[PDB]
Design a protein around this ligand. Structure first.
Ligand SMILES: Nc1ncnc2c1ncn2[C@@H]1O[C@H](COP(=O)(O)OP(=O)(O)O)[C@@H](O)[C@H]1O
Ligand SMILES: Nc1ncnc2c1ncn2[C@@H]1O[C@H](COP(=O)(O)OP(=O)(O)O)[C@@H](O)[C@H]1O
Ligand SMILES: [Mg+2]
Ligand SMILES: [Mg+2]
Lengths: 49, 498, 470, 163
């Protein structure tokens, strides 16, 4: 029970730090995220046409 | 094993690739457990929907320009102007052999924390029952473990036995003892004698559902039993659809070649949840503030639990509905509708339950339609006229010293105390046939009234060491001929004098 | 091409069809909808909402229909097979066979919606019908060619009363039978077909004389309400076009009014008493008037009514009592005492209970037995509180004779041999009148009360008292 | 003639009923400019909107007497019959719903919609929406697109719920 609680606390603490780093990277004006979001919309509409 | 978190992150990276094809539109208003969706022209009737916050919905009425969607969750997860999502299918749930050992909910999602359920298909909740060509007579025996249920009103595979009664009388206790008594046949290799339980707790509290699942796992009974958790703290659509979702999962075993036992606890809680959603949609309330389709909701779900023929697989489905009466009123609106569709009932009076007679099974009220031919031949031969002698002894004792009345009062008191078992103490067919044969032949009249509990434990232990050939023949063959009847009378007479 | 429509609204059993052309369908019109299972669908028109749109009622499940589906009109009502080809087969509400024995090769197909007989085509009679029970051949006697009602609650004895009368009257009637079950159980339909084939009623490889109509409570509301019209159309053709004494057996008759009340709220109608439909007396009178005896043939209707939560003052039980010649009310209080069945003598009444049809001897025995039971029931407040010792000399003898007369009329049926354990007793009309007159005169006052319970006539009461005293 | 656009059934049937008689002899282009003048002189003016919420009037300034409220405005053909039906049936309070439903009929049979993300779409007037959406998505992604979203928020919430 102590080994499972230590593994669950380490996985929950590591997931909280990775979620905070992903939100801070998107607020720093990512130039690669803006170009990839526009190209994904044109490729999805052409496959269903 | 070697970074287990890296295996789940790689498989969940690429999944969303095509989910932008109009489909559903948006909503307009929401309230009283409903959601007036504006649009969705391609949505069919009784189809599954999804809100923007993740709440499921069911499009009931679809008029021109609007569509009435019934939310299965809270009203705070749907607002005005939120986009909807059409699933494309109807109200279905998961089924198959992989659901044995997990506690599912109303929509089929696991709530026990054991991960996903390995389902082998997807069956709809609103399924039609079989006709007269794919049905057969009930002939298999359903052992419940109780001595007063296996001899009076016995149950069979494919029949519907109701369990009426008041609160704190023995309604939920009769269904829990029948599921735990099937461990002697499900742990072996006989697939025809096994019966998968299906507990559908609808209307119960949150603490009562967690305590009942822990008691079945400690006695090796939760490995082959489906648990449908449906508390009263959820929406009104989740509790009303708990009866239809539990019947679809148990129907897969009857259509393939296995037996199933469904326990809808309780039937009175399901009628109150269906009336809440109908009263908010501006409907007509009939008797006891119920709609016109109150009798059709319980008759359609109970008609599917029938016994199939040899050309359909040979399986059957047993239904055990518990009716919660209000002060013993068996002539109510919800009480008369369940008794007219089931083949027998088990009345639980609150007067005999407080005196020590557990369970309080009335012989003059509870009966079984297809319970005579769907019983064991060894228990029916030893209990000759057991149902007729139990009802006549209760009426004579309530009005009472003659010579004829003294013989019926002494024999009737010993038979009622010996058939009353404790909680979580089920007996087999071989042990109950030896105890019922001594009380009907006059072998227990010389014993005292307080020694009725001590005589049952002493006779069962002596018959399993000094006469093992007579106990094994009654369970394998299931009947007793001339040689088996003479050996049982000689062993009971020698043990009663010592 | 036929008249095609488009589905505009769908709320349960009600499906509004919007026709694009000006030729809209009429009322009670069969509408077909294309699906994907080699069966299509069935829909009956109810009313018209206007603006080239009529509200129809589907006869099956409406799950899977989208807004804008093609709905073709057949041009007429829901037709069913009639004649001698429907005998022995299990038909449905739309006339299709459900017995898996091929299609019904019928010459003509009459509709389910038809008018009843007029006042000039009616034919009244007063022929008594012997059933075999001791409580029915003396109290409320049934009439040949009339409507019989078996009212009762849940678990009283409504299904067992219709099964015992069909095995001792319909087996030697000569004419064809019509067992149309509406709102029954799933196990009751399979058990009734297997028992009739082993006795010589429904022969699959020979000649049959009993029409079976499916329609349990597992279907939708449109199939349960239309189950009574499909079964009555086959029995009406055998008495008018052929001239035969048909026997209509409905089980139960209360399911026809309860199925229409659930769909009346979605059609625009306001609710009535106890949440029922406003056209309760108009819908029940149009179907009960067509199952009567005419000049071409008779029709003995033996339906059974269901009491709502043990209440005879409901809107579905009190409205059906004015369209039956003989009634058989089954009380729930007498069923728990040991009466088989619970034939209440103070509530059962018939029109054939007179001295001009049963004779002067049978009329005096019926009035004397009913007068003794009414005196003991009115004095039940003093016997249950003070006791039986508070009565006088005249009241003490009447209380003992009333208890033995109530148990003597309860005879064990042949179909209930597995639940009672005794054999089936079928007393005649002449033996039941002679046994009741001798017990009321003082010739059987020395016998016990248990010697007459679950017996036959005067011969079975004397043999049971001698065996219990030995 | 009924076009497949549904548009409710009770409140949206006001503009759909008058569109059948106005679609003859080419009388659909003049109805678009005449319907915009009736709503712009009864909303942002605060002068002729004195009887918009009151239940009085009763044939005093709504119908019959108009002159400057019909001839001097922009009504001469079938535009005068649309305001007379709303005054007798007490439907002058919802003038914005009748004018908005008339513009949706011309944009459905002679145009397109289906907005993807960010702002509006292109609203072509070719034929099918298969070849029109693929040729307009590549020309609009390069030109403009400030990106100041929906797909990035859904993927981040699914990873935190499985922790
Ligand atoms: N065989 C038995 N011996 C002793 N007590 C019993 C037995 N069967 C049931 N009980 C008691 O009856 C109670 C039933 O509780 P519950 O299930 O909540 O009400 P209901 O039975 O009306 O659903 C239990 O608390 C249990 O202690
Ligand atoms: N003649 C009889 N003797 C003993 N029991 C009977 C007799 N007739 C009916 N019963 C009992 O009445 C019950 C009726 O059950 P069911 O048909 O389900 O309800 P209902 O009669 O209200 O339709 C049966 O279980 C049967 O045991
Ligand atoms: Mg309980
Ligand atoms: Mg019945």
């Amino acid at each position: 029970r102590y080994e499972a609680q230590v593994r669950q606390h380490e996985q929950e603490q590591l997931a909280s730090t990775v979620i905070s780093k992903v939100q801070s990277e998107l607020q720093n004006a990512k130039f690669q995220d803006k170009v990839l979001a526009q190209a994904v919309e044109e490729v999805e509409r052409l496959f269903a046409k | 094993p070697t970074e287990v978190s890296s295996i789940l992150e790689s498989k969940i990276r690429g999944v969303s690739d095509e989910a932008n094809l109009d489909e559903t539109g948006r909503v307009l208003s929401v309230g009283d457990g409903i959601a007036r969706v504006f649009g969705l022209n391609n949505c069919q009737a009784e189809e599954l929907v999804e809100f923007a916050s993740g709440v499921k919905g069911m499009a009931l009425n679809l008029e021109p320009g609007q569509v009435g969607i019934v939310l299965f969750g809270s009203d705070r997860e749907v607002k005005e102007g939120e986009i909807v999502k059409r699933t494309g299918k109807i109200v279905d749930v998961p089924i198959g052999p992989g659901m044995l050992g997990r506690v599912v909910d109303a929509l089929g999602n696991p709530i026990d924390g054991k991960g996903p359920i390995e389902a082998t298909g997807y069956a709809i909740a609103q399924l039609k029952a079989p006709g007269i060509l794919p049905r057969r007579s009930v002939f298999e025996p359903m052992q419940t473990g109780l001595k007063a249920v296996d001899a009076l009103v016995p149950i069979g595979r494919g029949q519907r036995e109701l369990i009426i009664g008041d609160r704190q009388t023995g309604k939920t206790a009769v269904a829990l003892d029948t599921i735990l008594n099937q461990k002697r046949w499900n742990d072996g290799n006989d697939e025809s004698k096994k019966l998968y339980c299906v507990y559908v707790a609808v209307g119960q509290k949150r603490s009562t559902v967690a305590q009942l699942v822990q008691t079945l796992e400690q006695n090796d009974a939760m490995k082959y039993s489906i648990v449908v958790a449906a508390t009263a703290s959820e929406a009104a659509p989740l509790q009303y659809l708990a009866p239809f979702t539990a019947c679809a999962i148990a129907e897969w075993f009857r259509d393939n070649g296995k037996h199933a036992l469904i326990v809808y606890d309780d039937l009175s809680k399901q009628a109150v949840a269906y009336r809440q959603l109908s009263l908010l949609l501006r409907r007509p309330p009939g008797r006891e503030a119920y709609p016109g389709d109150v009798f059709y909701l319980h008759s359609r779900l109970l008609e599917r639990a029938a016994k199939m023929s040899d050309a359909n697989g040979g399986g059957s489905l047993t239904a055990l509905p518990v009716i919660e009466t209000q002060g013993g009123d068996v002539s109510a609106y919800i009480p008369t509708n369940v008794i007219s569709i089931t083949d027998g009932q088990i009345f639980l009076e609150a007067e005999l339950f407080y005196k020590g007679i557990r369970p309080a099974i009335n012989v003059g009220l509870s009966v079984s339609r297809v319970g005579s031919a769907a019983q064991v031949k060894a228990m029916k031969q030893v209990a000759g006229s057991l149902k007729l002698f139990l009802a006549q002894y209760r009426e004579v004792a309530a009005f009472a010293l003659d010579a004829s009345t003294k013989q019926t009062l002494s024999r009737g008191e010993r038979l009622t105390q010996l058939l009353k078992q404790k909680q979580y103490s089920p007996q087999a067919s071989e042990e109950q046939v030896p105890v019922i044969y001594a009380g009907v032949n006059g072998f227990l009249d010389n014993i005292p009234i307080e020694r009725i509990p001590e005589f049952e434990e002493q006779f069962i232990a002596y018959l399993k060491a000094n006469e093992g050939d007579i106990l094994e023949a009654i369970r394998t063959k299931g009947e007793l001929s001339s040689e088996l009847l003479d050996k049982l009378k000689s062993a009971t007479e020698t043990f009663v004098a010592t | 091409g036929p008249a095609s429509g488009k589905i505009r609204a769908v709320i349960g059993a009600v499906v509004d069809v919007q026709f694009e052309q000006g030729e809209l369908p009429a009322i009670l019109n069969a509408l077909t909808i294309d699906q994907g299972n080699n069966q299509k669908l069935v829909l009956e028109v109810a009313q018209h909402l206007g603006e080239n749109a009529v509200r129809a009622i589907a006869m099956d499940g409406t799950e899977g229909l989208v807004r804008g589906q093609t709905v073709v009109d057949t041009g007429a009502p829901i037709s069913v097979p009639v004649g001698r080809g429907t005998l022995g087969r299990i038909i449905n509400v739309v006339g299709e066979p459900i017995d898996e024995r091929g299609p019904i090769e019928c010459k003509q197909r009459n509709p389910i919606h038809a008018d009843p007989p007029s006042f000039v085509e009616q034919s009244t009679e007063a022929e008594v019908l012997e059933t075999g029970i001791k409580v029915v051949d003396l109290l409320a006697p049934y009439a040949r060619g009339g409507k019989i009602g078996l009212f009762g609650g849940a678990g009283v004895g409504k299904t067992v009363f219709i099964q015992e009368l069909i095995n001792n009257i319909a087996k030697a009637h000569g004419g064809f039978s019509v067992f149309t079950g509406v709102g029954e159980r799933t196990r009751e339909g399979n058990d009734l077909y297997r028992e009739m084939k082993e006795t010589g009623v429904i022969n699959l490889e020979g000649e049959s004389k009993v029409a079976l109509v499916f329609g349990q409570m597992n279907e939708p509301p449109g199939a349960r309400a239309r189950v009574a019209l499909t079964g009555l159309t086959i029995a009406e053709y055998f008495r008018d076009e052929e001239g035969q004494d048909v026997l209509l057996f409905v089980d139960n008759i209360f399911r026809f009014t309860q199925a229409g009340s659930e769909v009346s709220a979605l059609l625009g109608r306001i609710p009535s008493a106890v949440g029922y439909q406003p056209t309760l007396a108009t819908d029940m009178g149009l179907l009960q008037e067509r199952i009567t005896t005419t000049r071409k043939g008779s029709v003995t209707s033996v339906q059974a009514v269901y009491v709502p939560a043990d209440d005879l003052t409901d809107p579905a039980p009190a409205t059906t009592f004015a369209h039956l010649d003989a009634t058989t009310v089954l009380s729930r209080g007498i069923s728990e005492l040991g009466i088989y069945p619970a034939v209440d003598p103070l509530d059962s009444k018939s029109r054939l209970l007179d001295v001009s049809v049963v004779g002067q001897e049978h009329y005096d025995v019926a009035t004397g037995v009913q007068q003794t039971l009414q005196a003991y029931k009115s004095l039940q407040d003093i016997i249950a509180i003070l006791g039986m010792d508070e009565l006088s000399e005249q009241d003490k003898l009447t209380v003992e004779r009333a208890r033995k007369i109530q148990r003597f009329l309860s005879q064990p049926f042949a179909v209930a041999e597995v639940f009672t354990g005794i054999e089936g007793k079928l007393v005649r009309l002449k033996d039941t009148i002679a046994s009741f007159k001798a017990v009321l005169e003082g010739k059987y006052d020395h016998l016990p009360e248990n010697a007459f319970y679950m017996v036959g006539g005067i011969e079975d009461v004397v043999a049971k008292a001698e065996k219990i005293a030995a | 003639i009924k076009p497949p656009v549904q548009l409710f059934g009770l409140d949206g049937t006001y503009a759909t009923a008058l569109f059948s008689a106005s679609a003859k002899d080419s009388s659909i282009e003049k109805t678009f400019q005449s319907v915009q003048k009736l709503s712009s002189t009864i909303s942002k003016d605060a002068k002729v909107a004195q009887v918009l919420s009151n239940p009085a009037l009763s044939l005093n300034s709504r119908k019959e007497v108009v002159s400057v409220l019909s001839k001097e405005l922009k009504l001469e053909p079938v535009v005068s019959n649309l305001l007379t039906v709303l005054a007798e049936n007490n439907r002058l309070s919802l003038f914005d719903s009748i004018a908005k439903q008339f513009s949706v009929l011309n944009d459905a049979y002679n145009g397109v919609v289906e907005a993807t993300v960010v702002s509006a779409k292109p609203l072509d007037s070719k034929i099918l929406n298969r070849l029109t959406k693929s040729i307009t998505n590549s020309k609009y992604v390069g030109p403009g697109k400030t990106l100041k979203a929906s797909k990035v928020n859904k993927l981040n919430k699914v990873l935190s719920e499985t922790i």
